[PDB]
Amino acid sequence: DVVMTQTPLSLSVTPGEPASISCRSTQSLLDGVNPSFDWYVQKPGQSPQLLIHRGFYRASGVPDRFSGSGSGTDFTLRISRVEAEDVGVYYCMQRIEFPLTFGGGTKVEIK
Amino acid sequence: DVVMTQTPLSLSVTPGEPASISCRSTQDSDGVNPSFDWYVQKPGQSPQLLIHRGFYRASGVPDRFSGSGSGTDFTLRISRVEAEDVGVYYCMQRIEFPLTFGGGTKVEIK
Amino acid sequence: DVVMTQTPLSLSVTPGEPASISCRSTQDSDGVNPSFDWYVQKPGQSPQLLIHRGFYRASGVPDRFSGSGSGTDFTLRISRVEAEDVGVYYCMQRIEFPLTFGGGTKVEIK
Amino acid sequence: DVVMTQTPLSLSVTPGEPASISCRSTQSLLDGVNPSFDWYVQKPGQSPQLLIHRGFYRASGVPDRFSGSGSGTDFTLRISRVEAEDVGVYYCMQRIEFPLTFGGGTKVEIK
């Protein structure tokens, strides 16, 4: 139905060096309609943490070394310079919205 | 696309009498579960939520309003229509989709 | 609750002339990012999406329609109003919230 | 702002024996408005897998030993009899919807 491929599945980075993770989806475009991608990191001892929302926006209190970019069904999370505290498992997540369809309406009147 | 048919187009009711409004959707219809909301716009007011997800009444909606249905066919019933009920009623279909996740990316530092 | 004010209530335009419709929201307003959609209902048709998330046009919407704004204040502009544009236009605010996760539950078999 | 506590953080179960995981949220009720809880399992070599949607509904192809129940901000995932293939990390996820608020409308007419 819809497949998401995250590349790479493993990263060995040195502190100070950039890092980049890509996420690509196979949603048969039509009309979902709008795909949106978020990025999380899970580290031991914390709940999963939101890093990037809808491709581009950073959550509050996330270091500014984190950014995202992309288009269509291909999105990327970038770390400008990795720090040692960044070890973790990073996940991309696809949200598939659809705008609402409405009925024509029914006027209800009384006597 | 998806087309919604709401039936009837207008209701002239006598106070105290029930009313019934039906909504049908034309929703690949498997990786899809639709949900139906009912709003009413009353004269001089903006639209307000009435019934959420087919069956649940909004805060402050009288128990005279109920919903029923399944799949792509849902109905709003007003048990006894009162004067404060006058308005234009709309059904709305929301199409959720559960979220898909990629595999992990283990970031380790060597 | 949240109240939406749409300005003006009605537009009588001369063909070829621009039009402008404004929407303001009264949205704890920090763990909240609102998004604004614009729909139009034309005579004889059900409502149809026009502008999604403040700025993006729906499929088949002429480039004569554009949006602008920020926060809780957004505006729809029609550059040259044409006869096929007649209708009732509505703004709608969607309130997303990013998803919260619990910690893991490691299930192991001893 | 809103806290989610999943209990327990670790489970040692024997095959054939039931298991139960609970998730509790501290969303200041008002008006979000409607919280909804989903359950996933992550195992090595697969992407995370949806098990239970909106508290109660099982995804297609998920064994029927999985069910959910609950109310308010307290929800539970139940495995009637655990099988050895069920080892994994189980996550609850809270979705906070809000119904749409609409403007009053603007009649656009021409000459």
Numbering used by the authors:
A (entry chain A), D (entry chain A): 1 to 27, 27A, 27B, 27C, 27D, 28 to 107
B (entry chain B), C (entry chain B): 1 to 27, 27D, 27E, 27F, 28 to 107
Publication excerpt:
Overexpression of antibody light chains in small plasma cell clones can lead to misfolding and aggregation. In this study, we present an antibody light chain that maintains an equilibrium between its monomeric and tetrameric states. According to data from X-ray crystallography, thermodynamic and kinetic measurements, as well as theoretical studies, this antibody light chain engages in 3D domain swapping within its variable region. Here, a pair of domain-swapped dimers creates a tetramer through hydrophobic interactions, facilitating the revelation of the domain-swapped structure.
We also remove the constant region from #4C214A to obtain the variable region (#4VL), which forms a 3D-DS dimer. In the asymmetric unit of the #4VL crystal, two independent #4VL molecules form a single 3D-DS dimer. A pair of these 3D-DS dimers constitutes a tetramer. Within the 3D-DS dimer, the β-strand located in the C-terminal region (Leu96–Lys107) is exchanged between the protomers. When comparing the crystal structure of the 3D-DS dimer protomer to the #4VL model structure, produced using AlphaFold232, the hinge region is identified as residues Arg91–Pro95, which is a part of the complementarity-determining region 3 (CDR3). Interestingly, the N-terminal residues of CDR3 (Met89, Gln90, Arg91, Ile92, and Glu93) at the hinge region form a β-strand structure that interacts with a portion of CDR1 (Asn30, Pro31, Ser32, Phe33, and Asp34), which also forms a β-strand structure. Clusters of aromatic residues were identified between the dimers, indicating that aromatic interactions significantly contribute to the stabilization of the tetramer structure. The cluster composed of Tyr36, Pro44, Tyr87, and Phe98 forms a small cavity. Moreover, 13 hydrogen bonds were observed at the interface between the 3D-DS dimers.
